[PDB]
Amino acid sequence: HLEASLMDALLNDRPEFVRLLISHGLSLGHFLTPMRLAQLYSAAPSNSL
Amino acid sequence: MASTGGTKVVAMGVAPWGVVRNRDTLINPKGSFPARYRWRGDPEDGVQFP
């Protein structure tokens, strides 16, 4: 319930939701599985540098 | 999280050893590990509380 909630807190920019979820605590060792990091970099904007 | 300033209140959870079920058996040399506990990994909820 908290895991996929922080994804949309990260993929959509929304940093104030990120501080809330970490305040209620996530794993970050079961959250930062390398699929989700590649998922995180996949939401970079297309016309970026 | 309510008061965002806070002072990070301190609370000692005096527990018995023979109840914690996900005991990683912290490092027998001198007990100095930063060793992380495994939290949600349990199908049991019996007399084996974390």
mmCIF file with all atom_site columns, C-alpha atoms in Angstrom:
data_model
loop_
_atom_site.group_PDB
_atom_site.id
_atom_site.type_symbol
_atom_site.label_atom_id
_atom_site.label_alt_id
_atom_site.label_comp_id
_atom_site.label_asym_id
_atom_site.label_entity_id
_atom_site.label_seq_id
_atom_site.pdbx_PDB_ins_code
_atom_site.Cartn_x
_atom_site.Cartn_y
_atom_site.Cartn_z
_atom_site.occupancy
_atom_site.B_iso_or_equiv
_atom_site.pdbx_formal_charge
_atom_site.auth_seq_id
_atom_site.auth_comp_id
_atom_site.auth_asym_id
_atom_site.auth_atom_id
_atom_site.pdbx_PDB_model_num
ATOM 1  C CA . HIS A 1 1  ? 0.000  0.000   0.000   1.00 0.00 ? 1  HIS A CA 1
ATOM 2  C CA . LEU A 1 2  ? 2.914  2.348   0.661   1.00 0.00 ? 2  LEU A CA 1
ATOM 3  C CA . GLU A 1 3  ? 5.254  0.974   -2.012  1.00 0.00 ? 3  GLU A CA 1
ATOM 4  C CA . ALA A 1 4  ? 3.358  1.908   -5.176  1.00 0.00 ? 4  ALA A CA 1
ATOM 5  C CA . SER A 1 5  ? 2.200  5.095   -3.467  1.00 0.00 ? 5  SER A CA 1
ATOM 6  C CA . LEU A 1 6  ? 5.751  6.410   -3.319  1.00 0.00 ? 6  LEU A CA 1
ATOM 7  C CA . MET A 1 7  ? 6.308  5.524   -6.988  1.00 0.00 ? 7  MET A CA 1
ATOM 8  C CA . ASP A 1 8  ? 3.634  7.974   -8.110  1.00 0.00 ? 8  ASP A CA 1
ATOM 9  C CA . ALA A 1 9  ? 5.037  10.381  -5.541  1.00 0.00 ? 9  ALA A CA 1
ATOM 10 C CA . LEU A 1 10 ? 8.341  10.111  -7.404  1.00 0.00 ? 10 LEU A CA 1
ATOM 11 C CA . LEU A 1 11 ? 7.265  9.654   -11.032 1.00 0.00 ? 11 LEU A CA 1
ATOM 12 C CA . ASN A 1 12 ? 4.894  12.557  -10.768 1.00 0.00 ? 12 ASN A CA 1
ATOM 13 C CA . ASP A 1 13 ? 7.191  15.172  -9.208  1.00 0.00 ? 13 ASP A CA 1
ATOM 14 C CA . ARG A 1 14 ? 5.327  15.941  -5.911  1.00 0.00 ? 14 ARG A CA 1
ATOM 15 C CA . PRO A 1 15 ? 8.106  16.083  -3.286  1.00 0.00 ? 15 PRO A CA 1
ATOM 16 C CA . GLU A 1 16 ? 5.883  16.967  -0.336  1.00 0.00 ? 16 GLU A CA 1
ATOM 17 C CA . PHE A 1 17 ? 4.188  13.573  -0.578  1.00 0.00 ? 17 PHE A CA 1
ATOM 18 C CA . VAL A 1 18 ? 7.622  11.950  -0.546  1.00 0.00 ? 18 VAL A CA 1
ATOM 19 C CA . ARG A 1 19 ? 8.545  13.417  2.837   1.00 0.00 ? 19 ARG A CA 1
ATOM 20 C CA . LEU A 1 20 ? 5.259  12.144  4.290   1.00 0.00 ? 20 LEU A CA 1
ATOM 21 C CA . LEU A 1 21 ? 5.818  8.534   3.263   1.00 0.00 ? 21 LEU A CA 1
ATOM 22 C CA . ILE A 1 22 ? 9.416  8.465   4.482   1.00 0.00 ? 22 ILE A CA 1
ATOM 23 C CA . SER A 1 23 ? 8.152  10.049  7.718   1.00 0.00 ? 23 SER A CA 1
ATOM 24 C CA . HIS A 1 24 ? 5.834  7.076   8.123   1.00 0.00 ? 24 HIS A CA 1
ATOM 25 C CA . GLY A 1 25 ? 8.728  4.955   6.982   1.00 0.00 ? 25 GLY A CA 1
ATOM 26 C CA . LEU A 1 26 ? 9.372  2.781   3.982   1.00 0.00 ? 26 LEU A CA 1
ATOM 27 C CA . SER A 1 27 ? 11.812 -0.054  3.470   1.00 0.00 ? 27 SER A CA 1
ATOM 28 C CA . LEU A 1 28 ? 14.241 1.636   1.012   1.00 0.00 ? 28 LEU A CA 1
ATOM 29 C CA . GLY A 1 29 ? 16.023 -1.736  0.768   1.00 0.00 ? 29 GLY A CA 1
ATOM 30 C CA . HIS A 1 30 ? 12.906 -3.441  -0.492  1.00 0.00 ? 30 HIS A CA 1
ATOM 31 C CA . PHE A 1 31 ? 11.807 -0.197  -2.185  1.00 0.00 ? 31 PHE A CA 1
ATOM 32 C CA . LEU A 1 32 ? 14.948 0.540   -4.216  1.00 0.00 ? 32 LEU A CA 1
ATOM 33 C CA . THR A 1 33 ? 14.887 -2.723  -6.201  1.00 0.00 ? 33 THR A CA 1
ATOM 34 C CA . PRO A 1 34 ? 16.660 -1.941  -9.499  1.00 0.00 ? 34 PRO A CA 1
ATOM 35 C CA . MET A 1 35 ? 13.551 -2.375  -11.618 1.00 0.00 ? 35 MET A CA 1
ATOM 36 C CA . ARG A 1 36 ? 12.004 0.588   -9.815  1.00 0.00 ? 36 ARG A CA 1
ATOM 37 C CA . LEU A 1 37 ? 15.091 2.737   -10.364 1.00 0.00 ? 37 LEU A CA 1
ATOM 38 C CA . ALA A 1 38 ? 14.957 1.912   -14.061 1.00 0.00 ? 38 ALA A CA 1
ATOM 39 C CA . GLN A 1 39 ? 11.263 2.693   -13.748 1.00 0.00 ? 39 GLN A CA 1
ATOM 40 C CA . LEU A 1 40 ? 12.262 5.990   -12.132 1.00 0.00 ? 40 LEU A CA 1
ATOM 41 C CA . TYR A 1 41 ? 14.612 6.902   -14.964 1.00 0.00 ? 41 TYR A CA 1
ATOM 42 C CA . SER A 1 42 ? 12.069 5.861   -17.554 1.00 0.00 ? 42 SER A CA 1
ATOM 43 C CA . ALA A 1 43 ? 9.839  8.766   -16.573 1.00 0.00 ? 43 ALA A CA 1
ATOM 44 C CA . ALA A 1 44 ? 12.428 11.316  -17.613 1.00 0.00 ? 44 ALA A CA 1
ATOM 45 C CA . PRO A 1 45 ? 10.964 13.785  -20.132 1.00 0.00 ? 45 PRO A CA 1
ATOM 46 C CA . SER A 1 46 ? 11.651 12.967  -23.764 1.00 0.00 ? 46 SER A CA 1
ATOM 47 C CA . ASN A 1 47 ? 12.963 16.379  -24.846 1.00 0.00 ? 47 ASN A CA 1
ATOM 48 C CA . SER A 1 48 ? 15.443 16.609  -21.994 1.00 0.00 ? 48 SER A CA 1
ATOM 49 C CA . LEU A 1 49 ? 19.207 16.854  -21.854 1.00 0.00 ? 49 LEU A CA 1
ATOM 50 C CA . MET B 2 1  ? 5.233  13.977  11.942  1.00 0.00 ? 1  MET B CA 1
ATOM 51 C CA . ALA B 2 2  ? 2.550  16.125  13.624  1.00 0.00 ? 2  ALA B CA 1
ATOM 52 C CA . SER B 2 3  ? 4.968  18.690  15.001  1.00 0.00 ? 3  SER B CA 1
ATOM 53 C CA . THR B 2 4  ? 7.480  19.016  12.184  1.00 0.00 ? 4  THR B CA 1
ATOM 54 C CA . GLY B 2 5  ? 9.987  20.720  14.470  1.00 0.00 ? 5  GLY B CA 1
ATOM 55 C CA . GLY B 2 6  ? 9.901  18.221  17.342  1.00 0.00 ? 6  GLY B CA 1
ATOM 56 C CA . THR B 2 7  ? 12.749 16.934  19.455  1.00 0.00 ? 7  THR B CA 1
ATOM 57 C CA . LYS B 2 8  ? 12.624 13.237  18.376  1.00 0.00 ? 8  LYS B CA 1
ATOM 58 C CA . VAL B 2 9  ? 11.114 11.687  21.495  1.00 0.00 ? 9  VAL B CA 1
ATOM 59 C CA . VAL B 2 10 ? 12.966 8.795   23.057  1.00 0.00 ? 10 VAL B CA 1
ATOM 60 C CA . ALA B 2 11 ? 11.243 5.537   24.019  1.00 0.00 ? 11 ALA B CA 1
ATOM 61 C CA . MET B 2 12 ? 12.868 2.344   25.309  1.00 0.00 ? 12 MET B CA 1
ATOM 62 C CA . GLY B 2 13 ? 11.022 -0.782  24.205  1.00 0.00 ? 13 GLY B CA 1
ATOM 63 C CA . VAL B 2 14 ? 12.065 -3.349  26.836  1.00 0.00 ? 14 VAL B CA 1
ATOM 64 C CA . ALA B 2 15 ? 11.140 -6.682  25.233  1.00 0.00 ? 15 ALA B CA 1
ATOM 65 C CA . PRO B 2 16 ? 12.034 -10.337 25.813  1.00 0.00 ? 16 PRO B CA 1
ATOM 66 C CA . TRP B 2 17 ? 14.558 -11.970 23.510  1.00 0.00 ? 17 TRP B CA 1
ATOM 67 C CA . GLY B 2 18 ? 12.529 -15.119 22.922  1.00 0.00 ? 18 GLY B CA 1
ATOM 68 C CA . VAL B 2 19 ? 9.634  -13.330 21.211  1.00 0.00 ? 19 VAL B CA 1
ATOM 69 C CA . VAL B 2 20 ? 11.335 -11.361 18.391  1.00 0.00 ? 20 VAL B CA 1
ATOM 70 C CA . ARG B 2 21 ? 10.914 -13.731 15.463  1.00 0.00 ? 21 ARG B CA 1
ATOM 71 C CA . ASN B 2 22 ? 13.097 -12.201 12.775  1.00 0.00 ? 22 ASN B CA 1
ATOM 72 C CA . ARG B 2 23 ? 16.268 -12.167 14.889  1.00 0.00 ? 23 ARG B CA 1
ATOM 73 C CA . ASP B 2 24 ? 19.250 -11.827 12.585  1.00 0.00 ? 24 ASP B CA 1
ATOM 74 C CA . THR B 2 25 ? 21.439 -12.765 15.593  1.00 0.00 ? 25 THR B CA 1
ATOM 75 C CA . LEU B 2 26 ? 23.439 -9.540  15.717  1.00 0.00 ? 26 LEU B CA 1
ATOM 76 C CA . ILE B 2 27 ? 27.171 -9.822  15.279  1.00 0.00 ? 27 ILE B CA 1
ATOM 77 C CA . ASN B 2 28 ? 28.678 -12.063 17.972  1.00 0.00 ? 28 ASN B CA 1
ATOM 78 C CA . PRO B 2 29 ? 31.985 -10.165 17.749  1.00 0.00 ? 29 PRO B CA 1
ATOM 79 C CA . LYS B 2 30 ? 31.361 -7.380  20.252  1.00 0.00 ? 30 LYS B CA 1
ATOM 80 C CA . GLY B 2 31 ? 27.906 -6.344  18.990  1.00 0.00 ? 31 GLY B CA 1
ATOM 81 C CA . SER B 2 32 ? 28.778 -3.360  16.786  1.00 0.00 ? 32 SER B CA 1
ATOM 82 C CA . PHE B 2 33 ? 26.729 -4.043  13.663  1.00 0.00 ? 33 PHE B CA 1
ATOM 83 C CA . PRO B 2 34 ? 24.450 -1.504  11.970  1.00 0.00 ? 34 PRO B CA 1
ATOM 84 C CA . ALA B 2 35 ? 22.533 -4.626  10.891  1.00 0.00 ? 35 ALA B CA 1
ATOM 85 C CA . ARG B 2 36 ? 19.053 -3.958  9.555   1.00 0.00 ? 36 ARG B CA 1
ATOM 86 C CA . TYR B 2 37 ? 15.994 -5.887  10.693  1.00 0.00 ? 37 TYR B CA 1
ATOM 87 C CA . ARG B 2 38 ? 13.711 -7.670  8.234   1.00 0.00 ? 38 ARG B CA 1
ATOM 88 C CA . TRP B 2 39 ? 10.313 -6.147  8.856   1.00 0.00 ? 39 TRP B CA 1
ATOM 89 C CA . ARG B 2 40 ? 7.378  -7.367  6.735   1.00 0.00 ? 40 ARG B CA 1
ATOM 90 C CA . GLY B 2 41 ? 8.775  -10.772 5.802   1.00 0.00 ? 41 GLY B CA 1
ATOM 91 C CA . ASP B 2 42 ? 6.552  -13.054 7.871   1.00 0.00 ? 42 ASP B CA 1
ATOM 92 C CA . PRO B 2 43 ? 3.418  -15.109 7.153   1.00 0.00 ? 43 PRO B CA 1
ATOM 93 C CA . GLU B 2 44 ? 3.081  -15.810 10.883  1.00 0.00 ? 44 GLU B CA 1
ATOM 94 C CA . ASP B 2 45 ? 1.368  -13.630 13.462  1.00 0.00 ? 45 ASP B CA 1
ATOM 95 C CA . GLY B 2 46 ? 1.260  -16.023 16.404  1.00 0.00 ? 46 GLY B CA 1
ATOM 96 C CA . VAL B 2 47 ? 3.429  -15.886 19.539  1.00 0.00 ? 47 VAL B CA 1
ATOM 97 C CA . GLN B 2 48 ? 6.272  -14.659 17.307  1.00 0.00 ? 48 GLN B CA 1
ATOM 98 C CA . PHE B 2 49 ? 5.910  -10.886 17.442  1.00 0.00 ? 49 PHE B CA 1
ATOM 99 C CA . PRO B 2 50 ? 8.521  -8.609  15.803  1.00 0.00 ? 50 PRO B CA 1
#
